[PDB]
Subunit: 320 residues, 4 copies
């Protein structure tokens, strides 16, 4: 199949390359022509066309149904591209938003684009060589049509042990290949958002445990209550056969082996948006979510010094 | 090597069997003689001997250094066995406590046993489910002399390096290569059960992170939501897709996908969750050390509240609300 | 002064009565004419007039600047009234919204109304229980011109300085002396409902702090504790003793002591706690501003969980635990 | 009555003065003789005796039942005094511990002292002019005996509105005077400990709200979503007729009126012990206590920079 790709950052460029390596043709565009030419040089021979604008890209899509994948900075930039494509595309064409879009915008865009018969698909991704775990929303018609593109990008079943009771109606076998049609437009970015919220919580659980172990050698403790524990070795031993074995643990063991004191790191952690939006979904649904909440607030506080709340505490105490 | 094992519950019996399958001679004891004979039947090649009492077990250990592994219920029972061994063993013998003992008890026991030259080793194990065939992830404390001596025993029980990708940049002093085989000498006595305790605390937090996310997704179809804000999400398929290539890929996720595939409604579970000592003890360590631990704490409190109806705090909230 | 009031529920009717007791002429309207007549009966000295519709209410306001106070259910109902007034009023008239409106709606309404020169004032009130006799603590937003004009109305409704000790060091520029009387111009439109929203968020946290402490004390007699670690504590007397000279002395404590004196078991309350918009909206503001707010969040989540049985998250926890 | 007082810090000295002003005789001791002489000069004429040691103090207590109030730094110092008094006192004498003692130590001391017939009373206090709110444990015999001393120190009923349904058996009228016999030894310091835990939670609730209001003018917000709110005026207006009116609010309004930016404060807040012990009691009892927990953890984190947990988070993110 042929697909246009707008946005050639790390993920957009890699997506184009992996598609071209799996027998699909790509039409490439990015605001920066040097990035366009770099990705063109990375794409398998003759599997690619470079466009110079969005209209030129659309004109270069010659299949019955034009498919355009947008991988742009979330927000106004992605919205601008979507509206321009809304003007340039027509009935049964397909727009895929692979960005970290707030899922409610996906619901809105899909409704607008449907007034012209344009199908909207939101893809949340979690690479070039290993494939992309994908959670996506849209109509059955459009997601069926683009199934070959997604199958090309997905990791496939791999060598992990299969989940035992999966042979039943209601369970989509494509989930075992690492890509899942989650429901209508917006549901893919919604599931990806919660995936990131869970990830935040897992990260904070590990981070707290390692802090507790590191601080078991604290001067504030009496010497006979101290242990001088080896952080990198503990992360490593947990990699094999423990209940906490996980991709996150693997990363932590690599970072601790490099520099166990973590002296090279500030500890100032951003939150990309998905954490906040996960908490908002919890609020909307009256779901208690203390772990994702604690993870988000730890991130907020890591970026400031002492904040006004803490100054209020000191002021109250002094007033005693 | 020859090793005595007292306590033949699931873990003790499995440990005896795996040791014997790696060619070690094991002397078996349990308060219930029928359990001793059940475990003996599982050992092959004559590498198992049934003892009739704890003194008889000790008498059957003929090596220069007697090694006795205690795998009993936490608390008074383990303590009784350790005190009896204090009386029965002598200089350079080794007592291993493999239960989920509170690590401060290990510090006290090792100091006492050192009075007679008896070495005390605390072993914390993870992975008890798949352990017989797949091996045990182990975190253990004690003196270098004794833990060096029992290295073949621990290596027999550990999973080995396996086929996972090796961690980069480990060829440095300070980093124990045995960690890559799944068993780690953590420091002096008590440090093994301390590290295992924190492992469980982290596990609590990871479990709660998943449980919250799945609750949010499940309730995206809630009647309380406007119809046009709902999604009817497939919990088992979402669990499954995250298994391959995602940031939350993990053994806990594998279990969750299996449970959800079996029955997505989780019909068969009440939701009333117990907590063993380790979550509480991890939070105690955080407090002692002035470490913020909101995720482990939230996991513990969620468990507390899952076991009750509305509690007194909530009734106080209602009374205040009525008051204005 | 003359003022129209639309919405004669508990708060609207009480506000009309107190205004009239301070000599203001009030024009009354409510969708239910029987409520209008009930409130009219409570006004003395001819200072109340019953209107028959919102346009009739507006027609009965003969001052240079028409002032209309809207005290209706949050949401579509208040919005309908505000839009109708946008059509009926003109330059320099004043619309006051006294409900618990989401403050972003106040920002939008004030911008729209300024198209016709109509001034919009948001008033957040606290103390609705004792308000008729004791006055209303008020937080309000709008232009200086309009809020200056309605100052006698707000002063009539406020508690006044009373007999509490004055706050030291308030004789400074930047500090509004009206704050000492219990009504504060908080800034532009929306800022009054914003400050009131945060007031309620703090209240949630204070309530939960007390509720947790009382739960800890009540459960100090728990059967799960060893008998020699129990205390049988008297909740109502502990509440009472804290009223005089303690750090937790507060109106919430006064209410709690009263409720516990009435019935210490709190037998009559389920513990299932609702939450109006303000707790959620306070947390939304914290998120927007990247402010950690763990206590307000914990109070909200406690309320969520008080209303359900075991939820899906807890069933996921049970399923994972069974898995190993 | 006559009472010996050991420990003449702020509270010990004030307790001695207030007793002497209410018709009781005090015998004073402190390790620092200059502090002894300062308090002696503050005590009403001839209501006082200065002792030079614990034995001299006990010898100067000539009543049938010797009462000794210990107001010393918690821990080894208080324990040393209690053991020395255990040696010096006898049957039906009374030892009062007014410090911030961990209540389990009170249970232990009371049992030891009872082996000689010495009664042990723990008093938790929450001053000179206004009186002390007191929560105390011990036997009915000893607490009855010292009731005049406690009544002298308590605030009395004052001018606040009386709690309506208080005229019933089971409700101790002394609670309305601001001192409460809480049960056996240890129960007073236990109730005081939870009082402090509640106070922490109340403080953190206010502190969070003021932080939210202060940060409503944040640069990170778009200008049209900002309010520049007056912190001192908001605290003040809430003092009269609001649901949050409280002693803590009064203190906050005074601090904000002095310096609304709170520029003079670090925000580095200690935790004295009661917060931790409250949380431990919650754990022991399987009681969820997220608000007191969040308050304690905010204090822990206010005293450090970025901690090892946060560095673990940065390391994981970089590993992506
Ligand atoms: Mg636990
Ligand atoms: Mg709410």
């Amino acid at each position: 199949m042929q697909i246009g790709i707008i946005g050639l950052g790390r993920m957009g460029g890699n997506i184009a390359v992996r598609l071209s390596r799996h027998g699909h043709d790509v039409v490439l565009f990015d605001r920066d022509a040097a990035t366009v030419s770099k990705v063109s040089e990375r794409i398998e021979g003759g599997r690619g066309v470079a466009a110079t604008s969005l209209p030129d890209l659309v004109a270069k899509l010659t299949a019955k149904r034009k498919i355009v994948w947008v991988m742009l900075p979330c927000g106004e930039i992605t919205e601008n591209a979507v509206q321009e494509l809304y003007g340039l595309l027509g009935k049964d064409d397909i727009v895929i938003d692979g960005g970290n879009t707030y899922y409610k915008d996906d619901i809105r865009r899909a409704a607008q684009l449907a007034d012209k018969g344009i199908h909207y698909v939101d893809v949340g991704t979690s690479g070039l060589e290993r494939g992309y775990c994908m959670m996506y929303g849209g109509t059955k018609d459009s997601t069926d049509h683009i199934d070959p593109i997604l199958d090309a990008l997905a990791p496939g079943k791999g060598d992990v042990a299969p989940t035992p009771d999966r042979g039943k109606p209601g369970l989509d076998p494509r989930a075992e290949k690492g890509y899942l049609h989650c429901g209508p437009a917006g549901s893919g970015h919604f599931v990806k958002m919660v995936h990131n919220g869970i990830e935040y919580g897992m990260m904070q659980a590990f981070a707290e445990g390692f802090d507790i172990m590191k601080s078991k050698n604290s001067p504030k403790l009496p010497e006979d209550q101290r242990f001088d524990l080896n952080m990198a070795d503990i992360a490593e031993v947990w990699r094999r056969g423990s209940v906490v074995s996980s991709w996150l643990l693997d990363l932590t063991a690599e970072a601790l082996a490099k520099n166990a004191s973590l002296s090279e790191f500030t500890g100032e952690v951003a939150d990309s948006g998905e954490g906040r939006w996960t908490l908002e979904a919890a609020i909307e649904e009256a779901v208690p979510a203390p772990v994702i909440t604690a993870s988000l607030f730890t991130r907020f506080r890591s970026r400031t010094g002492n904040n006004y709340a803490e100054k209020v505490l000191s002021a109250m105490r002094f007033g005693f």
